[PDB]
Design an enzyme around this catalytic site. Structure first.
Site, PDB file in Angstrom:
ATOM      1  N   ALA B  20       4.212  -5.979   3.166  1.00 12.86           N
ATOM      2  CA  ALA B  20       2.959  -5.584   3.741  1.00 12.86           C
ATOM      3  C   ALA B  20       1.874  -5.429   2.689  1.00 12.86           C
ATOM      4  O   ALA B  20       2.116  -4.924   1.540  1.00 12.86           O
ATOM      5  CB  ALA B  20       3.101  -4.275   4.560  1.00 12.86           C
ATOM      6  N   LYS B  44      -1.041  -6.598   7.437  1.00 12.21           N
ATOM      7  CA  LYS B  44      -1.500  -5.534   6.594  1.00 12.21           C
ATOM      8  C   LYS B  44      -1.446  -4.210   7.359  1.00 12.21           C
ATOM      9  O   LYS B  44      -1.946  -4.142   8.474  1.00 12.21           O
ATOM     10  CB  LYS B  44      -2.926  -5.822   6.163  1.00 12.21           C
ATOM     11  CG  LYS B  44      -3.692  -4.759   5.430  1.00 12.21           C
ATOM     12  CD  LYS B  44      -3.151  -4.405   4.086  1.00 12.21           C
ATOM     13  CE  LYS B  44      -3.745  -3.123   3.493  1.00 12.21           C
ATOM     14  NZ  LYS B  44      -3.273  -2.753   2.043  1.00 12.21           N
ATOM     15  N   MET B  70      -5.627  -0.372  -3.681  1.00  7.77           N
ATOM     16  CA  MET B  70      -6.509  -1.129  -2.809  1.00  7.77           C
ATOM     17  C   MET B  70      -7.345  -0.192  -1.877  1.00  7.77           C
ATOM     18  O   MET B  70      -8.493  -0.563  -1.490  1.00  7.77           O
ATOM     19  CB  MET B  70      -5.746  -2.085  -1.941  1.00  7.77           C
ATOM     20  CG  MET B  70      -4.824  -3.074  -2.596  1.00  7.77           C
ATOM     21  SD  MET B  70      -5.659  -4.262  -3.615  1.00  7.77           S
ATOM     22  CE  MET B  70      -6.497  -5.268  -2.429  1.00  7.77           C
ATOM     23  N   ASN B 128       4.221   2.796   8.017  1.00  9.37           N
ATOM     24  CA  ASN B 128       4.128   2.964   6.624  1.00  9.37           C
ATOM     25  C   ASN B 128       3.916   4.424   6.354  1.00  9.37           C
ATOM     26  O   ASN B 128       2.783   4.946   6.560  1.00  9.37           O
ATOM     27  CB  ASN B 128       3.000   2.114   6.076  1.00  9.37           C
ATOM     28  CG  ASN B 128       2.689   2.366   4.651  1.00  9.37           C
ATOM     29  OD1 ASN B 128       3.323   3.139   3.971  1.00  9.37           O
ATOM     30  ND2 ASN B 128       1.660   1.712   4.188  1.00  9.37           N
ATOM     31  N   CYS B 131       1.251   6.846   3.834  1.00  9.40           N
ATOM     32  CA  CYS B 131      -0.096   7.280   4.158  1.00  9.40           C
ATOM     33  C   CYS B 131      -0.374   8.688   3.562  1.00  9.40           C
ATOM     34  O   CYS B 131       0.477   9.519   3.415  1.00  9.40           O
ATOM     35  CB  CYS B 131      -0.325   7.326   5.655  1.00  9.40           C
ATOM     36  SG  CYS B 131       1.038   8.118   6.469  1.00  9.40           S
ATOM     37  N   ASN B 195       8.103   0.713  -0.955  1.00 10.43           N
ATOM     38  CA  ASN B 195       6.692   0.607  -1.309  1.00 10.43           C
ATOM     39  C   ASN B 195       6.544   0.629  -2.866  1.00 10.43           C
ATOM     40  O   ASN B 195       7.501   0.795  -3.626  1.00 10.43           O
ATOM     41  CB  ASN B 195       5.889   1.755  -0.693  1.00 10.43           C
ATOM     42  CG  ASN B 195       4.437   1.371  -0.289  1.00 10.43           C
ATOM     43  OD1 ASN B 195       3.705   0.777  -1.048  1.00 10.43           O
ATOM     44  ND2 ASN B 195       4.067   1.643   0.942  1.00 10.43           N
ATOM     45  N   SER B 196       5.317   0.451  -3.329  1.00 10.04           N
ATOM     46  CA  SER B 196       5.014   0.494  -4.740  1.00 10.04           C
ATOM     47  C   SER B 196       5.439   1.792  -5.424  1.00 10.04           C
ATOM     48  O   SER B 196       5.504   2.916  -4.796  1.00 10.04           O
ATOM     49  CB  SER B 196       3.514   0.160  -4.980  1.00 10.04           C
ATOM     50  OG  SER B 196       2.687   1.161  -4.397  1.00 10.04           O
ATOM     51  N   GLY B 251      10.262  -6.306  -6.638  1.00 13.98           N
ATOM     52  CA  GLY B 251      10.702  -7.086  -7.727  1.00 13.98           C
ATOM     53  C   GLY B 251      11.334  -8.417  -7.468  1.00 13.98           C
ATOM     54  O   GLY B 251      12.083  -8.886  -8.359  1.00 13.98           O
ATOM     55  N   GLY B 272       6.277  -9.263  -2.380  1.00 13.45           N
ATOM     56  CA  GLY B 272       4.893  -8.816  -2.633  1.00 13.45           C
ATOM     57  C   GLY B 272       4.264  -9.503  -3.817  1.00 13.45           C
ATOM     58  O   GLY B 272       3.673 -10.565  -3.658  1.00 13.45           O
ATOM     59  N   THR B 273       4.319  -8.877  -4.984  1.00  7.63           N
ATOM     60  CA  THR B 273       3.639  -9.312  -6.165  1.00  7.63           C
ATOM     61  C   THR B 273       3.896 -10.801  -6.449  1.00  7.63           C
ATOM     62  O   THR B 273       2.978 -11.560  -6.732  1.00  7.63           O
ATOM     63  CB  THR B 273       4.086  -8.433  -7.398  1.00  7.63           C
ATOM     64  OG1 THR B 273       3.660  -7.042  -7.224  1.00  7.63           O
ATOM     65  CG2 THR B 273       3.528  -8.954  -8.649  1.00  7.63           C
TER      66      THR B 273
HETATM   67  C1  LIG Z   1      -2.300  -5.629  -3.141  1.00 10.73           C
HETATM   68  C2  LIG Z   1      -1.149  -4.879  -2.455  1.00 10.73           C
HETATM   69  C3  LIG Z   1      -1.384  -4.324  -1.168  1.00 10.73           C
HETATM   70  C4  LIG Z   1      -0.369  -3.592  -0.545  1.00 10.73           C
HETATM   71  N1  LIG Z   1      -0.574  -3.002   0.643  1.00 10.73           N
HETATM   72  C5  LIG Z   1       0.430  -2.473   1.332  1.00 10.73           C
HETATM   73  C6  LIG Z   1       0.221  -1.976   2.686  1.00 10.73           C
HETATM   74  O1  LIG Z   1      -0.882  -2.188   3.272  1.00 10.73           O
HETATM   75  N2  LIG Z   1       1.294  -1.430   3.280  1.00 10.73           N
HETATM   76  C7  LIG Z   1       2.491  -1.286   2.697  1.00 10.73           C
HETATM   77  O2  LIG Z   1       3.389  -0.779   3.346  1.00 10.73           O
HETATM   78  N3  LIG Z   1       2.769  -1.694   1.440  1.00 10.73           N
HETATM   79  C8  LIG Z   1       1.753  -2.208   0.698  1.00 10.73           C
HETATM   80  N4  LIG Z   1       1.936  -2.717  -0.555  1.00 10.73           N
HETATM   81  C9  LIG Z   1       3.259  -2.612  -1.119  1.00 10.73           C
HETATM   82  C10 LIG Z   1       4.069  -3.841  -0.977  1.00 10.73           C
HETATM   83  O3  LIG Z   1       4.313  -4.014   0.390  1.00 10.73           O
HETATM   84  C11 LIG Z   1       5.430  -3.642  -1.672  1.00 10.73           C
HETATM   85  O4  LIG Z   1       6.055  -2.531  -1.076  1.00 10.73           O
HETATM   86  C12 LIG Z   1       5.337  -3.404  -3.170  1.00 10.73           C
HETATM   87  O5  LIG Z   1       4.246  -4.179  -3.710  1.00 10.73           O
HETATM   88  C13 LIG Z   1       6.647  -3.772  -3.911  1.00 10.73           C
HETATM   89  O6  LIG Z   1       7.109  -5.127  -3.765  1.00 10.73           O
HETATM   90  P1  LIG Z   1       6.852  -6.165  -4.981  1.00 10.73           P
HETATM   91  O7  LIG Z   1       7.545  -5.613  -6.186  1.00 10.73           O
HETATM   92  O8  LIG Z   1       7.370  -7.440  -4.421  1.00 10.73           O
HETATM   93  O9  LIG Z   1       5.357  -6.169  -5.218  1.00 10.73           O
HETATM   94  C14 LIG Z   1       0.953  -3.448  -1.208  1.00 10.73           C
HETATM   95  C15 LIG Z   1       1.187  -4.057  -2.461  1.00 10.73           C
HETATM   96  C16 LIG Z   1       0.161  -4.731  -3.094  1.00 10.73           C
HETATM   97  C17 LIG Z   1       0.463  -5.283  -4.441  1.00 10.73           C
HETATM   98  O1  LIG Z   2      -3.789  -0.177   0.229  1.00 14.01           O
HETATM   99  C1  LIG Z   2      -3.149   0.355  -0.685  1.00 14.01           C
HETATM  100  O2  LIG Z   2      -3.773   0.868  -1.580  1.00 14.01           O
HETATM  101  C2  LIG Z   2      -1.708   0.391  -0.681  1.00 14.01           C
HETATM  102  N1  LIG Z   2      -1.037  -0.129  -1.818  1.00 14.01           N
HETATM  103  C3  LIG Z   2       0.363  -0.117  -1.930  1.00 14.01           C
HETATM  104  O3  LIG Z   2       0.968  -0.564  -2.904  1.00 14.01           O
HETATM  105  N2  LIG Z   2       1.067   0.469  -0.848  1.00 14.01           N
HETATM  106  C4  LIG Z   2       0.411   1.072   0.229  1.00 14.01           C
HETATM  107  O4  LIG Z   2       1.110   1.577   1.099  1.00 14.01           O
HETATM  108  C5  LIG Z   2      -1.010   1.059   0.303  1.00 14.01           C
HETATM  109  C6  LIG Z   2      -1.678   1.661   1.370  1.00 14.01           C
HETATM  110  C7  LIG Z   2      -1.516   3.263   1.299  1.00 14.01           C
HETATM  111  C8  LIG Z   2      -2.446   3.902   2.278  1.00 14.01           C
HETATM  112  C9  LIG Z   2      -1.959   4.090   3.601  1.00 14.01           C
HETATM  113  C10 LIG Z   2      -2.738   4.633   4.671  1.00 14.01           C
HETATM  114  C11 LIG Z   2      -4.001   5.073   4.412  1.00 14.01           C
HETATM  115  C12 LIG Z   2      -4.484   4.905   3.117  1.00 14.01           C
HETATM  116  C13 LIG Z   2      -3.750   4.351   2.039  1.00 14.01           C
HETATM  117  C14 LIG Z   2      -4.390   4.283   0.726  1.00 14.01           C
HETATM  118  F1  LIG Z   2      -4.388   3.080   0.243  1.00 14.01           F
HETATM  119  F2  LIG Z   2      -5.753   4.760   0.775  1.00 14.01           F
HETATM  120  F3  LIG Z   2      -3.779   5.097  -0.239  1.00 14.01           F
END
Ligand SMILES: Cc1cc2nc3c(=O)[nH]c(=O)nc-3n(C[C@H](O)[C@H](O)[C@H](O)COP(=O)(O)O)c2cc1C
Ligand SMILES: O=C(O)c1[nH]c(=O)[nH]c(=O)c1CCc1ccccc1C(F)(F)F
Ligand SMILES: Cc1cc2nc3c(=O)[nH]c(=O)nc-3n(C[C@H](O)[C@H](O)[C@H](O)COP(=O)(O)O)c2cc1C
Ligand SMILES: O=C(O)c1[nH]c(=O)[nH]c(=O)c1CCc1ccccc1C(F)(F)F
Lengths: 313, 313
Positions: B20, B44, B70, B128, B131, B195-196, B251, B272-273
């Site tokens: 996501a 997203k 973001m 997710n 939040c 998640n991250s 990863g 993701g990345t």
């Molecule tokens: C630019 C960006 C935006 C992301 N936005 C979301 C998000 O909207 N919701 C979410 O659950 N995870 C979000 N993540 C987290 C990714 O879904 C994932 O959990 C995390 O990047 C680890 O996987 P990776 O090592 O393949 O990057 C985001 C990651 C990146 C890099």
């Molecule tokens: O949009 C992001 O910043 C983001 N980046 C990630 O690596 N994982 C995430 O889950 C998110 C969104 C986190 C989130 C969730 C709900 C409301 C607001 C936010 C936040 F980005 F403002 F922290």
């Protein structure tokens, strides 16, 4: 141009030392660290009684870093105390002694005995807060009320400046809370950020097996995996604890990595996994590399850039 | 030999999908993921109202991974709900819709309206839980009583099977508690780990500057940095949640990394990345590399090795 600095009323030839647990368990290890070009050394975190630690294999390393679940193997407090008291050559460099008791009482009993040697010799205490806690609870530094109790008890029992070794945090409210607890203790003069990133899991694809034996293969991560986490913690604490020092630890393999920690706010820079992998020769290379980055930038002192990482707008 | 899987009453050609937030913001993104060779896609994470997100630069990538803050830029729930109900081609692959409201009530209002589209079109909900809470409190999934509240209210309001996206944990007591909470909720049928890795800090040595603008340069880490952390979380939840699926995320850059996830317990594997960096062509390479590993080991299906990571003794 030379890297010498003065802190906690001691002089250090340079800001490098081993990280607690690496090359610091035995008399042989401590003599080898003393003979190195490190600016200081820290002994293995100890318990009142010796420990054999966990079954092997319990440490493994890879291109991007390391995993360990050592189980705190150590010679016991009486050994490290005798080392600090009778064996260490303080004319060579300062010594930190790390302690990590199984209970608040164990910690208090060791620091009471350490206090007189710290007065006599100037050995410095690093209290390892990644220590076991009461049932159901995370490690002490992830339970802010336990962490406050441990620091109250230790401050009272010890009565002298000391430092704490912290695990990484990952949430800004946690940084806020953790720093507020530490700031309640004026004797805590340095904070070391960070311990290993807890409970990662390395799997080997060929054998389809985990690579360390204890805890079903789970263990703390160190090395390149953890540098951005380490820099975050260093800078979070540096910002929130302006009356304390911050020591950086995590992912140091080059003078550049070290440079980054110092920019983040580090006074001293600890080396774990890379020291385990490369050996004590690494300290000459790290000094040389960090001086070379400084020359190229026109910096003459560490003080000129410590904590001066720039933010964007 | 095949990558097929059947789960949650859907059929997937292979276990790969985007993580996501990556390549899933816009109709153009979603059509691109749909066009790709991925076994599925997720949208997203959204809020009720559209968001511009944080100031740029807010994502950067490097050899070992990425950092982002973001601020959840997104087109708003009405857009993702319309994509799911009117625009997505379900004959191509299944769709996950991710939600991340700023309060329990904003989550409840969104899932109430998603429910009929979930029943009629088969869109699957990923909630997710990273939040924000009340600011000054940690993210929801690091506050177990808030996480419980959110899951009770979303379970009641939605009444259909859904999944949860989890941040990484680093302490066994945390794994234990987090899994116990999730195990209270029989409608939580899948758990996505992870998640991250929260609030790391990347510093550029040349410029002496953080590399993203929000939050003084602090942001979530992805990529190679976080694989052992992600594997640990997949396996921890796999072992603690026997009636739930675990999806792996973190990863993944190769069929071997995907193999490890699967060994750990992963059903679906999110990218993701590496997808951000390489583009949607990565899916064909991942499938080819995973099939090559399976062929060399004699594995014909994913269930032959899912969760079969070996421990030592
Ligand atoms: C630019 C960006 C935006 C992301 N936005 C979301 C998000 O909207 N919701 C979410 O659950 N995870 C979000 N993540 C987290 C990714 O879904 C994932 O959990 C995390 O990047 C680890 O996987 P990776 O090592 O393949 O990057 C985001 C990651 C990146 C890099
Ligand atoms: O949009 C992001 O910043 C983001 N980046 C990630 O690596 N994982 C995430 O889950 C998110 C969104 C986190 C989130 C969730 C709900 C409301 C607001 C936010 C936040 F980005 F403002 F922290
Ligand atoms: C084999 C091994 C033993 C360790 N023992 C201790 C210890 O006894 N006390 C402690 O505070 N940290 C200990 N650590 C953590 C390191 O001191 C350091 O915080 C961590 O490895 C991250 O730094 P690095 O990236 O340079 O490895 C140990 C690390 C390793 C790899
Ligand atoms: O000896 C270790 O496994 C170890 N490894 C690290 O990466 N950091 C540490 O801090 C430690 C010691 C942790 C500890 C401290 C107090 C009692 C018991 C232990 C434990 F090793 F058994 F976990």
């Amino acid at each position: 141009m030379c890297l010498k600095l003065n802190l906690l009323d001691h002089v250090f030839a340079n800001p490098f030392m081993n990280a607690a647990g690496v090359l610091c368990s035995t008399e042989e290890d401590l003599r080898c660290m003393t003979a190195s070009s490190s600016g200081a050394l820290v002994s293995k975190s100890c318990t009142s009684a010796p420990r054999d630690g966990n079954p092997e294999p319990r440490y493994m390393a890879f291109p991007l870093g390391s995993i360990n679940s050592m189980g705190l193997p150590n010679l016991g407090f009486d050994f490290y105390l005798k080392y600090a008291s009778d064996l260490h050559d303080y004319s060579k460099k300062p010594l930190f002694l790390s302690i990590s008791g199984l209970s608040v009482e164990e910690n208090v009993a060791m620091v009471r005995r350490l206090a007189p040697v710290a007065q006599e010799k100037g050995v410095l205490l690093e209290l390892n807060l990644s220590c076991p806690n009461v049932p159901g609870k995370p490690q002490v530094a992830y339970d802010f009320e336990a962490m406050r109790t441990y620091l109250q008890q230790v401050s009272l029992a010890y009565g002298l400046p000391f430092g704490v070794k912290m695990p990484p945090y990952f949430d800004i409210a946690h940084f806020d809370t953790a720093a507020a607890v530490l700031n309640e203790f004026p004797l805590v003069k340095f904070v070391t950020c960070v311990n290993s990133v807890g409970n990662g899991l390395v799997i080997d694809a060929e054998s389809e097996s985990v690579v360390i034996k204890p805890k079903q293969g789970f263990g703390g991560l160190g090395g390149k995996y953890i540098l951005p986490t380490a820099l975050a913690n260093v800078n979070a604490f540096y910002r929130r604890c302006p009356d304390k020092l911050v020591f950086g630890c995590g992912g140091v393999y080059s003078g550049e990595d070290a440079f980054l920690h110092i920019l983040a706010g580090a006074s001293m820079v600890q080396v774990g996994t890379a020291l385990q992998e490369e050996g004590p020769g690494i300290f000459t290379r790290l000094e040389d590399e960090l001086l070379e980055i400084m020359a190229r930038k026109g910096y003459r002192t560490l003080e000129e850039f410590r904590g001066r990482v720039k933010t964007i707008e």
